[PDB]
Amino acid sequence: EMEKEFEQIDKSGSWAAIYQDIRHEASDFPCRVAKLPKNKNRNRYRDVSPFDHSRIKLHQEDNDYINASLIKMEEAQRSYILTQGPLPNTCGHFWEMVWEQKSRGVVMLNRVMEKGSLKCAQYWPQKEEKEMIFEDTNLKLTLISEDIKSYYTVRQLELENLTTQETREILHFHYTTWPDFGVPESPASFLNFLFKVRESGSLSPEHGPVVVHCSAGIGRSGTFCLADTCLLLMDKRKDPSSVDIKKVLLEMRKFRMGLIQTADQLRFSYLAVIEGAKFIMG
Ligand SMILES: CCCCCNC(=O)[C@H](Cc1ccc(N(C(=O)C(=O)O)c2ccccc2C(=O)O)c(/C=C/C(N)=O)c1)NS(C)(=O)=O
Numbered sequence: 709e710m711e712k713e714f715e716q717i718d719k720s721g722s723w724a725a726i727y728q729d730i731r732h733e734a735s736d737f738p739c740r741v742a743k744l745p746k747n748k749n750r751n752r753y754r755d756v757s758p759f760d761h762s763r764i765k766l767h768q769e770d771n772d773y774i775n776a777s778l779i780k781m782e783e784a785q786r787s788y789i790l791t792q793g794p795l796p797n798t799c800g801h802f803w804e805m806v807w808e809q810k811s812r813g814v815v816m817l818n819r820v821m822e823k824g825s826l827k828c829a830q831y832w833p834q835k836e837e838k839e840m841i842f843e844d845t846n847l848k849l850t851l852i853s854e855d856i857k858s859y860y861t862v863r864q865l866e867l868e869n870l871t872t873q874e875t876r877e878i879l880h881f882h883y884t885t886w887p888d889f890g891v892p893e894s895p896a897s898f899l900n901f902l903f904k905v906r907e908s909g910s911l912s913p914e915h916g917p918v919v920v921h922c923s924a925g926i927g928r929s930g931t932f933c934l935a936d937t938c939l940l941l942m943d944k945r946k947d948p949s950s951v952d953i954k955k956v957l958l959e960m961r962k963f964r965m966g967l968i969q970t971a972d973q974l975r976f977s978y979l980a981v982i983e984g985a986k987f988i989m990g
Pocket residue numbers: 753754755756822827890922923924925926927928929965966969970
């Protein structure tokens with residue numbers, strides 16, 4: 709029972725200690741491509757890079773680099789591409805990735821501006837009649853429809869490979885209420901958002917991996933993938949109480965560094981799973 713464990717950590721207020729154990733135990737792999745001088749402007753943060761072994765490669769002989777990692781969860785049979793919020797100069801790379809990986813959905817967990825500064829480039833069109841064209845990767849993006857709700861917005865986008873004239877519908881799930889500081893009060897809206905993404909089929913095997921990002925693509929984005937996999941596993945195993953969130957996180961960290969950046973985010977992940985289980989259980 710993780711809820712029982714949850715209350716113990718709370719009781720003895722040892723979240724930071726536990727979060728630190730995970731940090732210490734976390735995998736560590738080379739990120740040589742990410743560090744090449746030629747890719748300096750393709751990274752938002754100097755200390756956030758994709759491991760070479762799990763990085764997403766753009767299908768171009770020029771520079772195949774993009775700060776994105778493929779998190780493959782074998783047992784849960786779920787895959788996620790975690791990436792950084794695109795930069796002014798990497799929006800075309802971003803959509804090129806979405807196209808080449810055949811993703812069905814993009815999940816955004818932050819706002820373009822937070823705390824008064826830019827945390828992500830405006831990579832999608834805001835008005836139907838004003839489509840976007842990424843000349844460097846030869847892609848066209850058009851806002852087809854938008855549905856603004858209280859805690860999130862879902863947008864229907866059309867991505868066109870100008871080279872082949874081929875087009876695909878891309879769903880953009882934007883969680884718009886994540887607080888500037890800290891984590892949400894309750895995982896309720898976050899969980900609802902998660903189920904909305906699921907219900908769309910964007911997380912399903914018939915499509916490429918969903919693309920998930922926030923600013924660095926490790927903290928909030930980690931919370932999303934962690935909660936989803938844990939819930940899925942509790943649904944798959946005949947003994948749901950065997951699902952160990954700390955274990956799941958360490959496994960995910962083998963594919964991208966620093967998923968879950970604070971003790972608050974860790975605690976929140978527990979809440980989300982526990983609360984999500986009480987509902988998803990039936
Ligand atoms: C693995 C390497 C990490 C080493 C530390 N590096 C950093 O914090 C940063 C990168 C970095 C790492 C994690 C961040 N973070 C995230 O959840 C996220 O965006 O992935 C959050 C982190 C903590 C709390 C909240 C958030 C958040 O956005 O919710 C953020 C976002 C902060 C913000 N909202 O302004 C930035 N690098 S640098 C050059 O020192 O600035």
